[PDB]
Write a protein that binds this ligand. Structure first.
Ligand code: NAD
Ligand code: NAD
Ligand code: AMP
Ligand code: AMP
Ligand code: GLU
Ligand code: GLU
Ligand code: GLU
Lengths: 651, 660, 339
């Protein structure tokens, strides 16, 4: 295998281009197109979308009806088709074309020397600044073929272009207005199997229109679990009554992959690697999407599927994609602030309801001064405050076996604090079972929980769990009698990599006062097992890929390596001093991934199977056997380990 | 409300009748029909099905084509219809009827003075002893109306008769051979909404045919989540070439409600109360059934629905239904032997797989000499045997706090036995959390009980880490149902629970089953017997398990409302002499329960099951489903909130169940 | 004329409500609904949308299949219907209801003492944290009627509720997931004449989900030239595995009219005056919208139109709407910089 090849990992590189329009001069337009397409080829792109009516210019009005213009358009089209014999990408080029009685506003789908299909715009705006019905006919419901350079090629709104050697890539094409009506051709296309939706746009620019284009491309890409590739007209279009901004953009399932400078001087491209496996995975999981298709079975089975062989490049062509280091921790500070606000409120409101339902039990929690319990204590306190409960009904315990932050935190919040030395009970228990270990660690971990549960019976409380999602993922907890067990776990949904940011978020908001903030800060400074289970930054990364998308190990390694191999590349969330910004080699990423698949798929499930209650937090998922993760407690991880042996280089 | 009314609890009483045939004499047949129907009326039946071609006799061949016969059939039908003005049940009577060009083999659905519909047989056998196509036309695909006694009434294979004041009762009718073809009219009818499927049969009798009729009525009632009411011809049919057996039967979702004497002298009826709520509940739950309907949407939306008002009796008319005392413990010894065999093998194989998957850990189990742990030890032993594991890899512990059966059993099986006194650890813990007992006060608290319960589990878990084993849970289904366990650190928790699916009422019969098979030898059997003798004679606070296991089954399988469960349990349990007891209830341990008691324990049940206990089931260790009634895994049969009140159930009991 | 009357100028006042859920207690839920609906009445609202499965609570799982729960739901529904004789707004209340073989996840459209229609959810998520297919049947393609308190009322995904004395107000109802699939029932409804699209949502909250709800409600309102009224479940839903944020919002042709506090303590409403003339005008001008309808003529002519008379208040009830002084000059500095 070629492990560094984006194409071998299910990416398809796509381009949205804005060329230089020369109105009423198809030769000139074709030349600009040819030159941009050659760039896309050099970039290893599989697809290159151009603006509405590329070969004539969108804005020429009744000049679209002139024989000499239409004849010149055909001539130029045929030259492009001939040039395309040598170009890698599928070109989607706009052109006014004669068919039957009229000219249609069409997108010509071109590939390796042939026209694959010709797709007419369905809805022609004839209102405000738009007069398209005057010159051009609507495409909705046209089928059949059209004769282009002595060949009959598929013509109509119902076409799909499927790469025979790259099945994740199935192209559908619509045109500008098409995406703005209640029931866009692209939405039926997605249900029928289209994964990459192209839009050629003319779209003169006005205040607020760029937002409208975004709103609709973004929502389409999200609602149809698809990439949406959009190209609008720019410099060169007539400014008789309108101006043009050249916007290009590429969306993927609601996320912006790329966009280009608005009002550029010169031509611009958006180029991005679309993850066809992502779309595959989203669709495999959201059964209601298939249900929608079956309900519109007639609409969706009637698409004609045109095949082509892409034969993309096999080598290292980089990865034109922003892979964030912390799938659970957004690098953008505004976005991170928002996530924290949500995570915190989820945790709190999860706990408020349990407490309301139990008519306000005391809250029993083991506080050790570490990140997890510190944060849980804070969550508990807020929940109690919001429910008008005295903080003294929170019972915090230090349980020393064989830290100062804990008592300082508890005194500062003003909950009830208490120490119980479990050492003697442990000594008694170790002696009673005849121990001279994991047994040694576990006797203490167990007795901590045993004590808390009993205190909870005694004092009318519930025991608050504090184990985080990353520990659930790797089975890094003592199961049953031990920290795995509790009456309600507020941390169950929060991965370890997010925890430290919640604590800062709490400090930064300042709600608990200056003294509490200082202790919390101390906890952070002090606290920041990764020796045996690996760095949580890496295991949280793999967890997200597995839990959300079920990606194979080699795909996960590829992604993590692009995100993590170079500390200077990409973005870091706030709060990583340059001394704690590590980079990881492939060898490391591989290593921790072996530990991960073995622990996640095989070892740890029985511990998640009997999990106490607690709220889902991340869109990446949570690990409740009653919600996001239903799996066997008795399965081997052989095939994932084997996939790593076979597909991931040793370094 | 009227609490003792079967009808007010969702039952509909149905009859399958076999009359006296007088061939070629419709007046005589009608007179027999009228007299049987009056009986059904007196019984408060809603429905009375008669044999194929009732009014003429099935067996009269070309006499069916005689004008005078056909004319007399019509006259007799009209007299029935007139007499039916005063009759409670819907009558389904067979009759050869003229329509368009031919006579159809029909079933006339009659009610309170009117004909609701006429249903022609769809498939007319013309092979072997059957010549139906010679005299009569196929009904499949006939629709429209037929003119009967100056009224136009629905005619066709596509009809449903729905009780407007009793929505669980939607009738479809088919005739004999109809149920024998790959795609019977009744199967489409059920997808369309029919819940009670009638079959009028002629069906001359031959060796093995009664089995065939059963196979097909039973499977239809099961596959269609319906009652199936069946009536065949008997005495009086011609014996020119055939004999007749008069078989009648009533099925419900695969179970036999009732059947009559074969080859009777005189007329016979099967009468039974069909539970429409049971059918409702099964259908509510089996979504693939509704999926089937949607797939045959065109077929199923094209049914015509004819409404009638049954207005059944409101009072106490008893309950013609066998309600078993132990929904989990079949009274029939053969069936009970079979269930035990299955329960045991499920438990064992569930554990064998966990052990294989863990490369054969030692099995750690707390044995106290009680039923549950005794049984688990046995299960564990057999699992180890089948996997060729030494029994000494089973580590049994007695964990005395503040019985001989346990050590005797362990020594006899030859597992590794050991005692660990948890009292000192408990004393230390109780003192450390400052509990009054540690300072003398005799305060036998929930905390006091729980410190010991918890420490047992704590010890076993640590032993399991120490010695390379897993801890076997032993808590049974009835304890899961009621939250009768110590949660988390405590007996609720384990590595694998082989008893999780087994209700308490079944456990004692598993143990006997094990003894009875004898597989473990005479010494082991003697100790097991001793465990039974000792342990059978907390049911003070949570109630008798016979009652709670009863309510559990109703709730878990059907979601029945409390008053419905009280009605059922009262009919099963109020009288110790009535109904059957499984094997092994000496007459001194055959209690009966009053309504007051049944009510009382049901309040405790709904509160504990719907509200209190769910959190303890929510974090449940692994273990195999056993009963068709269901199991309580939050990953399987029971998905429910851990933080809900049971107010509405408690209220339903207040409102609907009399105080005594 | 009454010149200060929002209703006489083609506004229709609408509410999205988040009540207090008491799981498995329909009487309690109905009481909270009744109390919120009375507020909406006092505000002169024409429409009040509640969260998914309002009368039972969304999150109760297999408890939805218990006879006593389903029976209590019906009883409570009938009381609401009776109370609604005296209430101005159309209520849209969620309820698990028996029909044919199964329970449907339904929205009951209630008005002045009668049920106008019962609309089943079309797409039932059964993936990740969602298990709806286990307990409930899909509504897509169900038509006919359902029997509710001794009346047969329209049942199905194809319903429109049109105010006979206020023609700009034509209601269509869908449920949570319905707006998330490529071809939402609401998009066909708009082409057929719906101008106000309601969504009852359960929607447990997770990081980023509020944005997803916004993205999809906003885009729907814009793509369908319509008001979109959205109500999600909050306090009271089970937190066995999930938390709930009580978000309510009202969109109009891509613009946010109103939204409510997320994670509120107590019940919240979004109330706004929707401009039916605005939607009328947008639609009159964008001929491609009508072209889309003609292309899906079969889909769009098959809607059943249920009529009702709103008879809204004629007087001055203010105007719950932000009318900017400078239509050409946005008051928000970030937006103005961009323009
Ligand atoms: N940071 C934390 O949250 C935390 C807390 C405690 C321990 N730890 C770490 O993890 C370790 C805990 O050790 P552990 O996981 O070996 O102890 P554990 O008791 O949680 O898990 C092993 C136990 O479960 C049983 N088991 C294993 N697989 C099973 C399966 N499929 N089904 C049923 N039972 C199964 C084993 O026989 C054994 O009794 C510590 O030594 C330490 O390294 C971390
Ligand atoms: N034979 C057996 O199987 C067995 C064994 C031990 C005890 N028991 C019986 O059961 C009793 C156990 O008592 P118990 O059930 O009160 O103790 P428990 O510890 O099992 O349960 C109560 C504990 O759970 C918490 N809790 C209650 N509802 C909760 C919820 N909805 N969510 C989260 N946490 C919740 C309470 O705050 C308390 O800490 C004993 O007294 C005894 O009668 C039976
Ligand atoms: N020394 C301690 N005192 C009180 N609580 C503790 C102590 N150690 C651990 N805990 C609790 O048990 C959990 C286990 O932490 P750990 O095994 O160290 O990652 C912590 O998150 C606390 O909730
Ligand atoms: N005295 C005991 N000795 C050994 N095991 C016990 C003892 N008491 C309880 N157990 C274990 O805990 C389970 C719960 O029983 P109990 O709490 O006594 O009703 C039993 O089935 C045993 O597995
Ligand atoms: N329907 C949009 C189209 C916007 C565009 O073409 O970019 C309009 O108002 O014209
Ligand atoms: N098809 C069956 C008919 C049985 C019956 O009609 O009862 C046969 O072999 O004759
Ligand atoms: N289709 C969305 C639904 C989100 C919601 O229900 O709010 C999902 O991922 O579950």
């Amino acid at each position: 295998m070629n492990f560094y090849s984006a194409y071998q990992h299910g990416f398809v590189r796509v381009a949205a281009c804005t060329h230089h329009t020369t109105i009423g001069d198809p030769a000139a337009n074709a030349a600009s197109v040819l030159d941009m397409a050659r760039a896309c080829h050099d970039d290893g792109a599989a697809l290159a979308v151009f603006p509405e009516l590329t070969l004539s210019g969108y804005s020429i009005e009744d000049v679209l009806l002139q024989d000499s213009l239409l004849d010149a358009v055909e001539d130029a089209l045929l030259d492009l088709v001939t040039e395309s014999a040598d170009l890698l990408p599928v070109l989607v080029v706009g052109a006014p074309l004669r068919h039957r009685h009229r000219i249609y506003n069409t997108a010509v789908v071109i590939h390796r020397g042939a026209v694959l299909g010709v797709v007419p715009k369905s809805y022609l705006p004839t209102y405000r600044e738009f007069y398209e019905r005057r010159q051009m006919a609507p495409g909705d419901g046209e089928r059949g073929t059209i004769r282009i350079g002595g060949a009959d090629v598929a013509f109509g709104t119902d076409l799909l272009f499927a790469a025979s050697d790259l099945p994740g890539f199935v192209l559908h094409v619509e045109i500008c207005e098409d995406m703005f009506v209640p029931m866009p051709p692209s939405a039926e296309a997605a249900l029928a199997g289209a994964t990459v939706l192209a839009n050629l746009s003319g779209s003169p620019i006005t205040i607020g229109r760029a937002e409208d284009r975004r709103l609709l491309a973004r929502s389409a890409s999200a609602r149809c679990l698809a990439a949406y590739v959009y190209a609008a007209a720019g410099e060169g279009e007539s400014t008789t009554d309108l101006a043009w901004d050249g916007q290009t953009m590429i969306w993927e399932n609601g996320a912006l992959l790329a966009e280009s400078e608005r009002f550029p001087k010169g031509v611009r491209r958006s180029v991005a690697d679309v993850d066809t496996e992502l779309l595959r995975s989203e669709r495999l999981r959201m059964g209601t999407f298939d249900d929608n298709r079956r309900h519109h079975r007639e609409l969706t089975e009637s698409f004609r599927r045109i095949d082509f062989a892409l034969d993309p490049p096999a080598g290292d062509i980089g990865l034109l994609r922003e892979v964030e280091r912390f799938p659970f921790v957004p690098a953008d500070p505004q976005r991170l602030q928002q996530d924290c606000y949500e995570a915190y409120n989820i945790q709190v409101s999860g706990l408020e309801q349990r407490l309301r339902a139990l008519d306000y039990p005391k809250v029993v929690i083991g506080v050790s001064g570490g990140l997890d319990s510190t944060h849980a204590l804070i969550v508990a306190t807020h929940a109690m405050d919001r429910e008008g409960r005295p903080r003294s009904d929170i019972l915090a315990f230090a349980l020393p076996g064989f830290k100062n932050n804990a008592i300082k935190l508890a005194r500062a919040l003003g909950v009830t604090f208490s120490e119980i030395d479990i050492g003697d009970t442990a000594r008694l228990m170790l002696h009673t079972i005849g121990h001279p270990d994991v047994t040694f660690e576990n006797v203490q971990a167990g007795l901590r929980t045993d004590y808390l549960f009993r205190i909870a019976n005694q004092r009318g409380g519930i025991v608050l769990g504090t184990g985080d999602l990353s520990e659930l993922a790797l089975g890094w907890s003592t199961y049953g009698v031990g920290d795995q067990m509790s009456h309600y776990n507020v941390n169950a949904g929060v991965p370890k990599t997010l925890i430290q940011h919640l604590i800062r978020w709490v400090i930064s908001a300042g709600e608990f006062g200056e003294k509490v903030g200082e202790v919390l800060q101390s906890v952070l400074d002090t606290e920041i097992s990764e020796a045996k289970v690996g760095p949580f930054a890496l295991q949280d990364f793999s967890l997200f890929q597995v839990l959300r998308y079920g990606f194979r190990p080699s795909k996960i390694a590829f992604l993590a390596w692009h995100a993590w191999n170079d500390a200077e590349r990409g973005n870091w969330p706030p709060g990583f001093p340059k001394s704690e910004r590590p980079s990881y080699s492939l060898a490391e990423i591989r290593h921790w991934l072996q530990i991960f698949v073995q622990r996640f798929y095989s070892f740890s499930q029985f511990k998640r199977s009997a999990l106490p209650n607690g709220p889902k937090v991340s869109h990446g998922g949570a690990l409740s056997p009653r919600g996001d993760w239903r799996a066997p407690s008795d399965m081997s991880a052989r095939i994932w380990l084997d996939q790593i042996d076979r597909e991931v280089p040793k370094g």
